[PDB]
Amino acid sequence: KEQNGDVKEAASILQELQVETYGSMEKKERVEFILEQMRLCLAVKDYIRTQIISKKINTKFFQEENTEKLKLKYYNLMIQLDQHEGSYLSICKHYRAIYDTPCIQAESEKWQQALKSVVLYVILAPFDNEQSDLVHRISGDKKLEEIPKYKDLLKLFTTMELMRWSTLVEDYGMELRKGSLESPATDVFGSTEEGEKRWKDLKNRVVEHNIRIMAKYYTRITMKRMAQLLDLSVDESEAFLSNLVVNKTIFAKVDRLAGIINFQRPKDPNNLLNDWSQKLNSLMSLVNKTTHLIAKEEMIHNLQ
């Protein structure tokens, strides 16, 4: 029926597949017959049927009692269509599991695919927690520094100086040009629209991320000046603020009069805030004043 051109029977085979995977205990044949789930689904392209089936696919499976050596090729065949149908977080938990794909096979082309995709999922790591700890899961690899994009990871690491993305233009451009390593950059731009969504979403993601970095600092970079240093329009900075109100900029100060913003200067309760500052300042002055006092008082004992 695949070469018949009749994919009407996809609902038949996948409807019978739920019955033929429940009611018995099959370890070997079930993994062989779970490829039928996404086999015709490329012809079907049904999001709701994918919602029916990674759900029933990866319900109970970790590693053991299941080899075809070609397990991991099917793991690549699993969540690629979840990157197709989902957006960006879908590979955050997916490409973090292809680290043993070098351990199973020859590692030479794992530079090109595995060590290419080893950075993209932590690019798409959410800003709250997984970004913070998951960067150490790739940190420590000696094969990490052998990547030229290691420095791009370190530029995405922390304390981002507001940097020019025209410097990233030649990096991504020759990152398409060289076939020495990370050859599927042309696959990143594989679909006509998808790589463009990754790219505008990528520049978007870093141009929000650095705002979350300088948003830690109260140093007031005065966003009307920042829009001039960024060489971008203030109207798409209002769009950036539309990404900030859903990114919870909700504790901030805007101006009808100016366009300069403040990320701080709350109502400042003196029974709470200046309370707290006066507390830790006064007390830390007292007890830090206490320690090296008697400690140096013991240091002068040894001169006698």
């Binding site: 900030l244 109100v245 805007v254």
Partner: protein, 110 residues
């Protein structure tokens, strides 16, 4: 059922073939109400109050419930756009909704 805010079931009950023979000029206005609700749109709901006021003039006492749905979506608009803004221009923030500041000022101040 749109007062419990599910326009997808409105699509489902204009999608079932049983009551679809009873469709007409009445329920097109409901499809524009549910359309503006699933759009979360406000001026489009006013267009549903504009073209279909000729079946919303024969609308019952529940016009007040429809108006409270409109004003409640207006409330979600107001607690959406004002909430990041300490101090802002009124036409910068009404230019989003492209509506006059008179009724908006009255409902806000109210």
């Amino acid at each position: 059922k749109i007062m419990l805010n599910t326009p997808e079931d409105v699509q489902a009950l204009v999608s079932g073939k049983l009551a679809l023979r009873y469709a007409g000029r009445q329920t097109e206005a409901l499809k524009c109400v549910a359309q503006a609700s699933k759009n979360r749109s406000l001026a489009d709901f006013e267009k549903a109050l504009t073209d279909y006021r000729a079946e919303l003039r024969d609308d019952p006492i529940i016009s007040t419930h429809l108006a409270k749905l409109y004003d409640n979506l207006l409330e979600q608009n107001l607690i959406r756009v004002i909430e990041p803004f300490s101090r802002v221009q009124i036409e910068h923030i009404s230019s989003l909704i492209k509506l006059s500041k008179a009724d908006v000022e009255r409902k806000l101040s109210q």
